[PDB]
Homo-oligomer: A and B are copies of this chain.
Amino acid sequence: KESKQKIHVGPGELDDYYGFWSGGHQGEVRVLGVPSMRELMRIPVFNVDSATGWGLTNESRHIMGDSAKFLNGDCHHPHISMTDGKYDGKYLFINDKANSRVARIRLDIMKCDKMITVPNVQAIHGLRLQKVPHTKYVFANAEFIIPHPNDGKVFDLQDENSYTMYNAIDAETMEMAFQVIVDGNLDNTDADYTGRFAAATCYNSEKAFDLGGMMRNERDWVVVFDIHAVEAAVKAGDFITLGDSKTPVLDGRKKDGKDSKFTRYVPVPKNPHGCNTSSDGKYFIAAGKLSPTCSMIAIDKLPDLFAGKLADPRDVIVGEPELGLGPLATTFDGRGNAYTTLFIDSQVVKWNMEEAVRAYKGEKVNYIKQKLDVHYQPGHLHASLCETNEADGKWLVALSKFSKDRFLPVGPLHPENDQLIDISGDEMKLVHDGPTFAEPHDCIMARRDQIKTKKIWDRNDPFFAPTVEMAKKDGINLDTDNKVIRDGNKVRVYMTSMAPAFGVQEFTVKQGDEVTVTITNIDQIEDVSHGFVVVNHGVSMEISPQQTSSITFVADKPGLHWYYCSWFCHALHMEMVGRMMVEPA
């Protein structure tokens, strides 16, 4: 009834929830403790991390594939895998708008373990997960219409072969499952609580490239996907492929006004943005952005819509409440209220969904409960467990783009303001302003008990299994060996490390040799991480307890070159060093 949760997490006390923040155009994922709002860990994903060597090590570059050549990413939408509509703590997925990727993070090790470049698209933006029966598919929007093929003969966005596609990735294999060509474009997406339906907002129904063109239509739409119908067509072989990708491609466009089997287009005003599934599974709610509304699609009416039982796609709209200026996203407390960010008015508005549905029928009922000022210009917002049937109505985070005077000045570039709001009672209460770097757009919270992590690595972990395989071809037992393998101009150093000593403390090579150093940390004490840096060679990486990590570099400078442990690991940490001796050409 009253909103009175405690926010202080004192020394020695622990946070109640994990928070997983997108890193925005900085490209990483950040783990926070909630309600303290402190950053506990950074998980490199699309960024190159000097500390752990993500982007430099062989294990990381193998996961990134050819996209290892890119040093940037732009991530917005972190989501946790589900079983039976509840978080299962297995995986976190996130998009990369800058280089068109999806990444998977394993929540037991808190590392990115798979990455895919989505084929034949540009800019992976919207991303959310199937909820029921479990996260079989990752659903991802490609935002920008492009020519097909994109070979430089045709540039017109109006061409019959210019379009974008909705993407489904197999969550477990991290291979593409299928793609659906759509009209217009794609902004954000969500899924239902059965597995049959997904939905995405579109703001460029006009297929224009200019600002005024993209705002011409009074209504764009939410495109709804009959995933069962897509799956049936794939199983029957009723698909095409594009370019050199084997991914099954289904055509979800309207042809001469005739609907595809795979899609329905529900008109929604106007350049709508957020696309959020209510926790009771009743509605896809589209945030109206240029229209001061949200539109509520009754998921219960979608089978009739696809069966041809409804005379008009607008018939699945059962509410369209007027809320305020610039609605961008919606979340849920599991008590029947929705909470929507108003970018222009700079507020969070709390409103009762069933009352909004009755107001749409002509009933005189006030569905707006409260408007709370936020600081300033909120984008997305997220209530604890909102993406699950266990939405607990405890905490809300609103992620606001202009912090202005809310923090000390730090130069021309400002932090975002991610504000923690207590929603446990009848009144929302602002309790903490959290400055963050580079515009997290969205975040996701999980109860402490939904996340189970490893304290030390398993020696059979898939994360470094290819390196274990390399060692096997060299006849190396990584748990014990300290040896230097010579192979023409290639040199493969294998060593164990146990604080405060590297297992190989010197080695000699020829100028120009390509050197690979593989280190296995055989300490068993939790938290005794080691590092490895080769001075003046651009080489740096983490080796945590029982991990094997490897890095490759060319020894292009004759002479003595020191290497050292970068992770303070022991009172003799400064002395944990070695020498690479490079004999001149």
Interface residue A307 (Cβ < 8 Å from any Cβ of B): no
Q: Give the nearest-CB partner of A430 in chain B.
A: B11
Given contacts A403-B527, A533-B97, A538-B69, contact A39 B414 (CB under 8 A): no
Interface centre among A26, A108, A560, A567, by most B CB within 10 Å?
Answer: A560
**Copies of this chain present:** 2
User: Which one, A50-58, A165-173, A315-323, A329-337, is touching chain B?
Assistant: A50-58
A502 to chain B, nearest CB (A): 10
Residues of B within 8 A of A53 (CB): 72
C-alpha spacing A146/B579, complex, angstroms: 10
User: Which one, A78-86, A150-158, A479-487, is touching chain B?
Assistant: A150-158
Interface residue A542 (Cβ < 8 Å from any Cβ of B): yes
Interface residue A181 (Cβ < 8 Å from any Cβ of B): no
Residues of B within 8 A of A441 (CB): 568
Interface residue A575 (Cβ < 8 Å from any Cβ of B): yes
A557 to chain B, nearest CB (A): 8
C-alpha spacing A153/B511, complex, angstroms: 12
Interface residue A406 (Cβ < 8 Å from any Cβ of B): yes
User: Is B455's CB under 8 angstroms from A409's CB?
Assistant: yes
Chain A 532-577 residues near chain B, CB threshold 8 A: 533, 535-536, 538-540, 542, 544-547, 557-562, 564, 566-569, 571-572, 574-577
A346 to chain B, nearest CB (A): 11
A157 to chain B, nearest CB (A): 8
Give the residue of B110, B414, B546 whose beta carbon is less than 8 angstroms from that of A527: B414
C-alpha spacing A525/B411, complex, angstroms: 13
User: Is A209's CB under 8 angstroms from B39's CB?
Assistant: no
User: Is B152's CB under 8 angstroms from A558's CB?
Assistant: yes
C-alpha spacing A546/B99, complex, angstroms: 28
Q: Give the nearest-CB partner of A42 in chain B.
A: B437
Residues of B within 8 A of A412 (CB): 109, 454-457, 526, 529, 544-547
User: Is A12's CB under 8 angstroms from B506's CB?
Assistant: no
Give the residue of B48, B71, B432, B575 whose beta carbon is less than 8 angstroms from that of A271: B575
C-alpha spacing A365/B37, complex, angstroms: 46
A9 to chain B, nearest CB (A): 8
Interface residue A100 (Cβ < 8 Å from any Cβ of B): yes
Give the residue of B42, B146, B414 whose beta carbon is less than 8 angstroms from that of A560: B146
Residues of B within 8 A of A406 (CB): 11-12
C-alpha spacing A500/B455, complex, angstroms: 47
- When each residue 33-65 of chain A gets 1 if its CB lies under 8 Å from chain B and 0 otherwise, what string results? 100011111100011111111011000000000
User: Is B25's CB under 8 angstroms from A51's CB?
Assistant: yes
Chain A 304-327 residues near chain B, CB threshold 8 A: 326
C-alpha spacing A560/B521, complex, angstroms: 47
User: Is A454's CB under 8 angstroms from B146's CB?
Assistant: no
Residues of B within 8 A of A40 (CB): 407-408, 410, 415, 435
Give the residue of B46, B50, B375, B377 whose beta carbon is less than 8 angstroms from that of A73: B50
A551 to chain B, nearest CB (A): 11
User: Is A55's CB under 8 angstroms from B71's CB?
Assistant: yes
Interface residue A289 (Cβ < 8 Å from any Cβ of B): yes
User: Is A187's CB under 8 angstroms from B26's CB?
Assistant: no
Residues of B within 8 A of A42 (CB): 26, 437-438
Q: List 22 A-B contacts (CB under 8 A).
A: A14-B408, A15-B407, A25-B50, A25-B567, A41-B437, A47-B49, A51-B437, A51-B438, A99-B535, A108-B411, A144-B577, A146-B560, A149-B559, A152-B511, A203-B575, A209-B506, A210-B505, A214-B575, A271-B574, A409-B451, A409-B455, A412-B544
